[PDB]
Symmetry: C2
Subunit: 456 residues, 2 copies
């Protein structure tokens, strides 16, 4: 019965996902549940990056004036939003250490110390650190944050413009396949040549449209070529002896996913989060009755141990109206829930609940495992479609660039606006024209269109 903004802000608490009362506005704390629904959230990208030949490592958080000074050119749109550590306690530091906004500055300074010959390449390295960002605008939970809680930034370096180029497509493939297992409707774009990362040749970026019509970039890939490699003397000996600066390329994702995981799927009753990330995929509720209280709790365990292997199960020993329980777990979006009842075991059956369609059925205790699996899949497959449908439904594919029309069709329909692509009038005016924000170039079934839309 409430609009997104507060529904989100609400559930993002009633779900015990992220307390935000920490005295800083931009720095909330990930409560137990949230953390979990993140451990399993990133474990997915970690694996996709590990199988893909990446290697995670951890870099410092403090970037000194020196290096950071390289990140920019004059003081370009960068240093302006950065925290600085000036006092080394009571005294000054002689060295203005800074809180890592991005984190490439220190990683590149390092690749130098690692890349010497052409055999050192490539070094697709990544990390999931916590960056910062002096945010002047308004903060928004798990989205626009003063202190970003989960920021996975991958870095890779190659020996050629071609290897780099391809690395981007591999990444894009990773992020794609990643979101998919998370079930997140994405629209892949090529940020215009004026919304470019600092020193990037061009940028690709996954954008999704939250339930409010507003879009939100969640994933990002940039191709850097040598723009950095130079500034950081990250050179190397071509297989011919001669010297050549390395071709970088980086990509990152932030808490914005978990925000989107929350929204995209979450419903009025609260969460719904995909089973691939359910801190508890299945909840076992032992309904205690005056008679045969013991047997039930026994059945609970039997079910636990059985599901325990392939799945994440939890039981509500707790003393309280199964209601609050049923309700408490629905809000938390636990995919499946098993009611362990008396008149229920007597018939040799056990009853489940799909926290997605909220439909409740029974089934033979001898097919549990098979069911829980199939049911748990069906759910994902479903929530994933529901996700895609609401997505595709928000996407309007115009056939012509009438600006006075787009801004008009965006203040009623919203979501994203795809119009045929023609370099012609594809400049910054277009935005100061449609008065929106060009998500950039994009291909949607065949050729390329331009993606216009309202952003977060």
């Amino acid at each position: 019965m409430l609009e997104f903004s507060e529904w989100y802000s609400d559930i993002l608490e009633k779900a015990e996902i992220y307390d935000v009362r920490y005295p800083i506005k931009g720095c909330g704390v990930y409560l137990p549940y949230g953390f979990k629904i993140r451990r399993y959230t990133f474990e997915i990208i970690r694996n996709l990056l590990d199988e893909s030949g990446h290697d995670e490592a951890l870099f410092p958080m403090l970037i000194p004036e020196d290096l950071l000074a390289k990140e920019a050119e004059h003081i370009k749109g960068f240093e302006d939003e950065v925290y600085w550590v000036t006092h080394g306690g009571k005294t000054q530091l002689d060295v203005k250490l800074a809180l890592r906004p991005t984190s490439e500055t220190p990683i590149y300074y390092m690749m130098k110390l690692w890349v010497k010959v052409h055999t050192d390449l490539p070094i697709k390295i990544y990390q999931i650190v916590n960056t910062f960002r002096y945010e002047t605008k308004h903060t928004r939970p798990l989205i626009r944050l003063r202190e970003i809680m989960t920021f996975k930034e991958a870095h890779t370096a190659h020996s050629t413009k071609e290897e780099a180029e391809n690395q981007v497509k591999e990444a894009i493939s990773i992020y794609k396949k990643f979101f998919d297992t998370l079930g997140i409707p994405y629209l892949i774009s090529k940020r215009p040549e004026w919304d470019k990362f600092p020193g990037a040749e061009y940028t690709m970026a996954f954008d999704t449209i939250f339930p409010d019509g507003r879009t939100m970039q969640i994933a990002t890939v940039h191709n850097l070529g040598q723009n950095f490699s130079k500034t950081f003397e990250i050179i190397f000996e071509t297989p011919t002896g001669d010297k050549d600066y390395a071709y970088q390329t980086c990509y990152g994702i932030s808490d914005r996913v978990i925000a989107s995981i929350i929204a995209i799927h979450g419903d009025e009753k609260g969460l719904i989060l995909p089973p691939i990330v359910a801190p508890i995929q299945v909840v076992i509720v032992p309904l205690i009755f005056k008679g045969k209280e013991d047997i039930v709790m026994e059945k609970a365990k039997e079910i636990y141990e059985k599901l325990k292997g392939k799945f994440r199960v939890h039981i509500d020993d707790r003393d309280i109206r199964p209601g609050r329980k049923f309700n408490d777990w629905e809000i938390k979006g636990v995919p499946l829930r098993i009611e362990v009842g008396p008149k229920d075991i007597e018939n040799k059956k056990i009853t489940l609940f799909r926290r997605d369609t909220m439909e409740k059925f029974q089934v033979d205790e001898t097919q549990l495992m098979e069911v829980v699996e199939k049911t748990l899949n069906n759910i994902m497959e479903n929530i994933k479609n529901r996700a895609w449908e609401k997505f595709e439904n928000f996407i309007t594919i115009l056939e012509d660039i009438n600006p006075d029309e787009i801004k008009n069709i965006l203040s009623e329909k919203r979501g994203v606006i795809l119009v045929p692509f023609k370099e012609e009038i594809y400049n910054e005016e277009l935005e100061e024209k449609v008065e929106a924000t060009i998500l950039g170039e994009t291909e949607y079934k065949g050729n390329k269109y331009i993606a216009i839309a309202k952003t977060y």
Copy 2:
């Protein structure tokens, strides 16, 4: 032949663990093999924590002055070694946020809200973050650092004083077993009063002894009692409508573990980290020759898939002189090593290598999954037993409170010293009497001694 000092520093990097070349005193970067090794290193403590009623949370890293203030009565040698943020671009912050040293202040400002009724306690909460202590002193990679990248800090609240007590006696046990599965030898002191914590009643701690006879502190535990509850107004209606202040009790462990891991179990040749935490437990080196090539890379994977499930393996490809690998892998501490030439295949045999003894025995192939499984349980054991041995050989027990004696027995045997406990002379003077350091009481073999030693 070499000295521990550089032996450490040398391998830390020689083995791809921690690269301290990052331009900031004690602020290096964990390299891939470094991160990996620390992952499992720390997945243990996690589980131990999880499987014991704790919840992993994540709190902001920036504490505003306001708080870290009450984090003291005035300005007692504490706000001196704290990193402070002051600007946002070029605009001062007027609020002064600081880099978290003990990340407790916030977790308490927070408890202020999650506590209201006894129902809400106990709450055992922890996070494995990274702190920042401005250290003037000489840094020690993975030991005394300026940025402690891996600092798992637990925190607990209790309605009653006694509950806390058993919570500390629980923390210990946990760590005890944590370090037992890691193979580290420890000496649970009880830090003497005169040496306090910001606001702790009594502070328990675990000590280990590096091969250079200096003692290292791997674990610390506190009973913060109400000292903190009172300042952060952590009140809660007792089960009698009264207003009682919660009983705190925190504890954490730093990178010292992975440090104590390397140090303690390392040997001349290279690094010999325990199987549990072995980034790589088994390495299949398919020695490939001109003849019978594929055939080899075949039994390479026949062994992979075979072990793939219960163990972490790595077929070390690399078009390089096998001996280099064997050498390389011995350094990184990989426990078991597999070499599969064309002989063992025709003889239906297999050839293994044990890092702990550098022995190279063979055994039937059908008996693979069997050996490895069993061999490892041996290696880890064999190396743990060694460790204690050495440890026990660094602990010298006396019988008299003779300072002019102890001090001497140090610069002749080092390690840690125990002496019969006599409240009489268990004061700060005793330190200045042996110009060393006291670790506190300690129940080794019952007797209840007084550990004294030089420390890192």
